[PDB]
Design a protein around this ligand. Sequence first.
Ligand code: FES
Length: 115
Amino acid sequence: GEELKITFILKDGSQKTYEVCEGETILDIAQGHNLDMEGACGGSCACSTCHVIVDPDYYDALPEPEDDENDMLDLAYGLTETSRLGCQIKMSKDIDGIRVALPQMTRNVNNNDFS
Ligand code: FES
């Protein structure tokens, strides 16, 4: 088929560069691949860890969320000019070489496990 990819900047600063399909979501790849990362949305009724930021190349085409939706971003440290929403934007033909950064996360309160 046409093929696509996603780069994530790790909470460890590393780059990881993953082959995915169209219509896949960014927190959904991050925890679906179990990147070396912090977050909890992959658990059963656990979805409140929406926090990513984009490359200014692949943002420049992207929409802005509601005040309850963009709050799920703010929960991670150091929110930026190109912050993006982990269950509200996905891979399409225009993404072919996209990046995001995976920010450090304040509090998720799972004690032992989310999955
Ligand atoms: S990925 Fe869970 S709040 Fe968006």
